Amino acid sequence: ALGPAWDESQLRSYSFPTRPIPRLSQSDPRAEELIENEEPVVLTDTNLVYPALKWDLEYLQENIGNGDFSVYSASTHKFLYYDEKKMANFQNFKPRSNREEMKFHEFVEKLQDIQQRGGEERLYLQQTLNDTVGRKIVMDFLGFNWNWINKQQGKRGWGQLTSNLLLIGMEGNVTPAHYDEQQNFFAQIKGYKRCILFPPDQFECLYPYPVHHPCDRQSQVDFDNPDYERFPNFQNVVGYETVVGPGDVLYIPMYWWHHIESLLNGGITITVNFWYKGAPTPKRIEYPLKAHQKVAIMRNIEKMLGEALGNPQEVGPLLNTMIKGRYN
């Protein structure tokens, strides 16, 4: 009877309607049906990261090792990421978030400081779990529900687990809408994150940056102020929404757009995700294609032209030449 975990006033306000992602037992056939069919579902009882539910900044500082952690800094609540390698071919791009490597205890002191000095700055720890972690964390990791998630990997024909990303964010932190090219079981550990997903068939409404841009895979649309002149179909976007707290696992299917925010005035959030490579392309192709297969096609066309033209800055002009007065 502990009261409302959170309320609507902690959710940011946006221009589009949503329906709820279903929350189900891991033993419920409907939940298996959704995962099999690459639709989101929040599972409430996997115990996937049960051992980590005691994690907080003190336990982690004490136990997580002397390794380096990538900490992103932002002057705003939106943490747009950028691929550093791609900066070259978009000279007119300055980042809105710096990355800094620091020891875990330096990160905790950073938060303390900002908090104590009423600072505006925001931080977001995002670090792959690795060898360097302490004995207690290794034991917690080994206590994850591998039986369950390994079975899911076998049943969906997925490829290997590529990594586990540890995410520690400040209240109000936003990861803007983007899609990932792997399957993701998103395991909430501390605090609450609002997750807004969009299916791959809404590619037309979300206007991803060019593949060769540093922000490849993110939406160009500012959710806090959509430019309907440039992005008219953003007026047609409909999301699938949920709030995940400790113990919840959100299946975020490959290619599904997701916008993710830590609840306003909700304290720090901790999440560990589980990224798996997708099943291989099927022997025989079934027509017409699924949406994510079309996204795959479009990405490859952009890649190939960048290569063939010898310069990604020519992909736009060639593509426009191809369609104006011909296919539009």
Binding site: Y81, E84, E181, N184, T281, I285, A296, R299, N300, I301
Partner: peptide, 16 residues
């Protein structure tokens, strides 16, 4: 050809 165009990368989060 179709398989060529249907192959996907494995990029996630920050860079890849």
């Amino acid at each position: 050809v179709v398989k060529l165009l249907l192959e996907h990368g494995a990029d996630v989060x920050a860079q890849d």
